[model samples]
Target: YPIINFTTAGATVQSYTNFIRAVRGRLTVLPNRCGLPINQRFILVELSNHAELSVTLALDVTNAYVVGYRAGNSAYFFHPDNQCDAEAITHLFTDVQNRYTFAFGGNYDRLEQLAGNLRENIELGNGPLEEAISALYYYSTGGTQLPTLARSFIICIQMISEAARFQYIEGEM
Candidate 1:
């Protein structure tokens, strides 16, 4: 256990479902990154112990769609957004690589190296996004704003530090 330091202490059923749906929709934009058959649609499923924000920030920014049943503190909504497959996952890494290019100053080979390490992590059963999902889930309901929750999606994509091995894989950054 590498001191991941995140939690889902305040995860509500809506938050968890929405966040997981966001992950399901966002993560595997490429394909087959895991073995979950690549899917999502908002349900009371406890995918992880992980921990975000606004329904709009969730929907527009994080892809974490709707969830509202009643008017007060006791309500729930429904449905989901995307998949979490290999093409989806690898595609996500490619996006990460592309993002690094602008954010840090780096392109193709970048994704190659990072995605290479990413593939290995998946192969060994390290679970790229479980804990991340947990952390995000916690963030949504833990008294923070929607922006912070939405932002985590960006950093969380790196798999809580899985990128550490990647940066040194062939150093182009």
Candidate 2:
């Protein structure tokens, strides 16, 4: 069995229904609103005899929306007009990469390298504008801010430690 998907936009329900009517097939219409406004409409179509089709559709939709949303957020938060200095964005990205690389566990040798890079980038005027903007947005919109870099790095280290501690629990289970 094969699943076919088509997406189109219209302002009104009648308009969207007219568009879908042109498909010329019997289809199930499932409305979805994962995290958007109720007025925004979506149509999910599933073909017969395909169990994995729903998974595929979900992954496709999720990836597409997630990528677009992340790109929009990065642009809005880090654009020059938003006070996100290029150097700061670059540094933050680098830090994230390094954090992932060392498995979020602070290795002394790796920390030395990371610290050196941080110092160099900071000296080159790479600082916390991105993090600061993120913090401010959260603070204003949600009444709380995420941890700063130093705090987040420490938290990551602790998470790694806890995961290591619980690794044996999974095995024991």
Candidate 3:
């Protein structure tokens, strides 16, 4: 599935319901052992300041399988195995963040290339941003406040990218 399909524009209970239904539909149609576990199935959850309050509501009625919790910038996922379907789910979330990044900014091809470059550069001691010099371009264009803001912004992008890379690598092992 395309990463753009996971947009969080109209985040609501109905929206989440629809997504879950779609995932179930896809899982049923796909010819694989991509079945939900008997007891502890994985779930991707969007976090918020009111998450603790909202969780009680969810648990009270939904009877959802929530084995663990993690704090993320936007959303988090529950999974039996980190490498299972959760990898693809996390990739989708990473793509969402890439869309809003200064380097990617909705450029799908750039994002794809960056993913490859990140892996390549990890061993080379230079990351994609530095290799392409795009980070420098953004840095040079920024004014006093803009420079600091841009620095932090790009740092966040790189941080998320690194996290995803490490997750993929670890999953392979």
Clash-forming residue pairs, model 2 = none
Query: Which stretches of candidate 1 lie above 4 Å from their native place?
Result: 1-135, 140-142, 159-173
**What's the lDDT for all of these models?**
0.29, 0.25, 0.30
Ranking by lDDT: 3, 1, 2
Estimate the Cα RMSD of every predicted model relative to the unseen true structure.
15.6, 20.8, 16.2
TM-score of 3: 0.21
Q: What is the lDDT of residue 155 in candidate 3?
A: 35
Q: Rank the candidates by TM-score, best first.
A: 1, 3, 2
Residue 2 Cα positional deviation in candidate 2, in Å, after optimal superposition: 24
Clashing pairs in 3: none
> What TM-score, computed on C-alpha atoms, does each candidate reach?
0.22, 0.18, 0.21
Over 28-132, each residue of candidate 1 has an lDDT whose tens digit, in order, gives: 222222333423312121233322311111111122222211111222222212333213322221212121111210122333343443333222112334433
lDDT winner: 3
Count clashing pairs, candidate 3.
0
lDDT tens digits by residue: candidate 2, 116-150: 43333231101232232233234333443232332
Where model 3 places Cα greater than 4 Å from the true spot, the runs are: 1-144
Q: What's the lDDT for residue 144 in model 3?
A: 24
What lDDT does model 3 reach? 0.30
